[PDB]
């Protein structure tokens with residue numbers, strides 16, 4: 544397991560524009576296009592992202608390119624953020640992947656606001672951090688995925704991703 548395999552598991556792969564768990568237009572491996580309710584706006588974002596006039600459909604190679612860019616962007620966002628960088632630097636490789644996963648799903652600013660959870664992770668209080676992370680809209684809206692990510696923070700292992 545690695546961060547790419549982890550997020551590919553959590554996000555799936557769809558080659559046509561679809562709505563994500565929040566109802567937002569998305570494509571590929573969890574590539575959010577826009578929060579606008581206009582499908583036309585989403586298609587314009589897609590064409591700009593891919594560099595060609597798409598019919599709302601992309602190839603697997605194109606989806607993997609957006610995915611590479613999005614994983615890179617999540618890491619870059621962590622490293623530029625004064626709240627997330629010290630936490631990331633303090634973590635082992637598996638827990639770093641868990642933090643990248645959260646930033647991929649909800650964005651740098653969203654995760655950086657988890658002040659109490661971030662402190663517990665920095666302190667390596669893994670069971671306490673896991674309990675605190677579950678007290679969140681994130682956990683309530685996507686509980687199976689949040690449980691997998693939380694288990695990764697709690698244990699420092701890939702146990703939540705092995706049998707799937």
Ligand SMILES: [Cl-]
Nearest residue numbers: 671674675678
């Ligand atoms: Cl708590």
Ligand SMILES: [Cl-]
Nearest residue numbers: 677678679680
């Ligand atoms: Cl809550």
Ligand SMILES: [Cl-]
Nearest residue numbers: 685686687688
């Ligand atoms: Cl879920």
Ligand SMILES: [K+]
Nearest residue numbers: 554555563573
């Ligand atoms: K998805």
